[PDB]
């Protein structure tokens, strides 16, 4: 007659409150620690790889970023650390870091021609180019905006309105130009005192240029500032200007909304499928914990900073 344990000769270590290391027979791990180390698909929809461009450069159409003129549906956006192309002309985009919040909830865009380039019979849309945005060794400019310069030594006032008639929203961009001195201002445009006014059902704005002396960035001594707004299905947008105006030509239409994100990584692309994603790899496990990176997308196991989590289900 004997009563006792069901012994064994395995090897595995667990932790308890008053014994630091203890041997067990059966044990089960919960913390995954491996990744495939490449960018994959997510439920069968390819992501968007901006490669060597920025979000602003894509939305404004850099001459060196012409591969993304038409873009299909995506799931998440990948952006490299420290882009190289960006905005060729020095300046800034007003209310930045808030447009990125408007993104990550849009999964598909559509492009619409709102004001044709041939609709300006009393201006000049040809010679407005600069050497800071070259295309194959020649001066160029953005492709979604028009820079207007006097024609026949004149610059009449502008009154332009656009009436929305679709069933979805829009996104419009426009800008201003800051000069260096009075002679340049009277050589590009003609009037010495200029302004811009924009109004809609919920926005009211007036602007004036600044003329001063600054340093050199990318070989230029001028500046440009850009703005954005979202238009409702039945509203309208109005424009009035006298100079220093960068007119809009294309607009983006929101057609699908959902869940997305913006990443920052430098991992290369690979042709494979997965259902969870991290900025340094992918996960194909069923355990409920991981310690790879706290930013994820999809359904993912929970995150902890530890590196050992095994619960004992054995004896001894």
């Amino acid at each position, epitope marked *: 007659i004997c009563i006792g344990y069901h012994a064994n000769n395995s090897t595995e270590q667990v932790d308890t409150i008053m014994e630091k290391n203890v041997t067990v027979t059966h044990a089960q791990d919960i913390l995954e620690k491996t990744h495939n180390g490449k960018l994959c698909d997510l439920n069968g929809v390819k992501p968007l790889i901006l490669k060597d461009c920025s979000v602003a450069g894509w939305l404004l159409g850099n001459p060196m970023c*012409d591969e993304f*003129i038409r873009v299909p549906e995506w799931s998440y956006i990948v952006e490299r650390a420290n882009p190289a192309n960006d905005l060729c002309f020095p300046g800034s985009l007003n209310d930045y870091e808030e447009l990125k919040h408007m993104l990550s909830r849009i999964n598909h865009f559509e*492009k*619409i*021609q*709102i*004001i*044709p*380039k*041939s*609709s300006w*019979p009393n201006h000049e*849309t*040809s010679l407005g180019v600069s050497a800071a945005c070259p295309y*194959q060794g*020649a001066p160029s400019f953005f*492709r979604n905006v028009v820079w207007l310069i006097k024609k026949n030594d004149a610059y009449p006032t502008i009154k332009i309105s*656009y*009436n929305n*008639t*679709n069933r979805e929203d829009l996104l419009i961009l426009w800008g201003i130009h800051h000069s260096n001195n009075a002679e340049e201002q009277t050589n590009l445009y003609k009037n010495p005192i200029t302004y811009i006014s924009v109004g809609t059902s919920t926005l009211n704005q007036r602007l004036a240029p600044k003329i001063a002396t600054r340093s050199q960035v990318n070989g230029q001594r001028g500046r440009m500032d850009f703005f954005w707004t979202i238009l409702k299905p039945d509203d309208a947008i109005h424009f009035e200007s006298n100079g220093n105006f960068i007119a809009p030509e294309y607009a983006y239409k929101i057609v699908k909304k959902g869940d997305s994100t913006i990443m920052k990584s430098g991992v290369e692309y690979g042709h494979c499928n997965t259902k969870c994603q991290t900025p340094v790899g992918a996960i194909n496990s069923s355990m409920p914990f991981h310690n790879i990176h706290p930013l994820t997308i999809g359904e993912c196991p929970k995150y902890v900073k530890s590196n050992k989590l095994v619960l004992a289900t054995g004896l001894r």
Partner: antibody, heavy 126, light 112 residues
């Protein structure tokens, strides 16, 4: 000045192929779209092909679909058209014309044709 | 596809008096932004064509002050204020809203 000249016509029997060329000089050739237009004898005008400024997208009509090809070549300022499976009703005169404004990045961008060439003749016989 | 009709096929009107031609389409050539995509061309006897009007109203560089176009939706019209002896030729109508571009039958103008 701005001018366009074309050459490469002749007489070709049914079957086989042919090639025509337009050459330009006077403006930046790598910033504009180009078109082809054909006019049969005793009839009106019609439309054939369209290409972009760089050369990615292309469009053809339903009477020359899948049977014609259009391509550019920079650094020499030339445009080409290759005609396969020649029938008998393609006897006409061919023109090459450009857009009126630069950098069209859509299929129908609203710009028109401003500058036209002189023309070449292509015939099918025997 | 979109058929384009153009009547009449002959106009023996000269000189001094005005003139008018019409062009009709089987669909609405109106964009969502309020502009019409309709053009007019001209071919003098024995040479290449020459553009007249880009959109429904905007003239070109070289066209005299006499010519002017107006219309919307499906009916379009070209009007010549006064006619000279150098305005003999054929006129054409062209649409640019769809991917395949289509011309029309045309119209001759002859001195009578």
């Amino acid at each position: 000045q701005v001018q366009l000249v074309e050459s490469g016509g002749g007489v070709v029997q049914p079957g086989r192929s042919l090639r025509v060329s337009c050459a330009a000089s006077g403006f930046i050739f790598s910033n504009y779209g180009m078109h082809w237009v054909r006019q049969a004898p005793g009839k009106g005008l019609e439309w054939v092909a369209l290409t972009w400024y760089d050369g990615r997208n292309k469009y053809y009509a339903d009477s020359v679909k899948g049977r014609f090809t259009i391509s550019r070549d920079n650094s020499k300022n030339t445009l080409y058209l290759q005609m396969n499976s020649l029938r008998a009703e393609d006897t006409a005169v061919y023109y090459c014309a450009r857009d009126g404004f630069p950098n069209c990045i859509s299929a129908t961008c609203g710009y028109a044709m401003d500058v036209w060439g002189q023309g070449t003749t292509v015939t099918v016989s025997s | 596809d979109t058929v384009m009709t153009q009547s009449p096929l002959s106009l023996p009107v000269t000189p001094g008096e005005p003139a008018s031609i019409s062009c009709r389409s089987s669909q609405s050539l109106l964009h969502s932004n309020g502009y019409n995509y309709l053009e007019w061309y001209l071919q003098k006897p024995g040479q290449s064509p020459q553009l007249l009007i880009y959109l429904g109203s905007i003239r070109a560089s070289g066209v005299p002050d006499r010519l002017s176009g107006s219309g919307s939706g499906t009916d379009f019209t070209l009007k010549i204020s006064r006619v000279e002896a150098e305005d003999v030729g054929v006129y054409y109508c062209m649409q640019g809203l769809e991917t395949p571009f289509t011309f029309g039958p045309g119209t001759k103008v002859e001195i009578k």
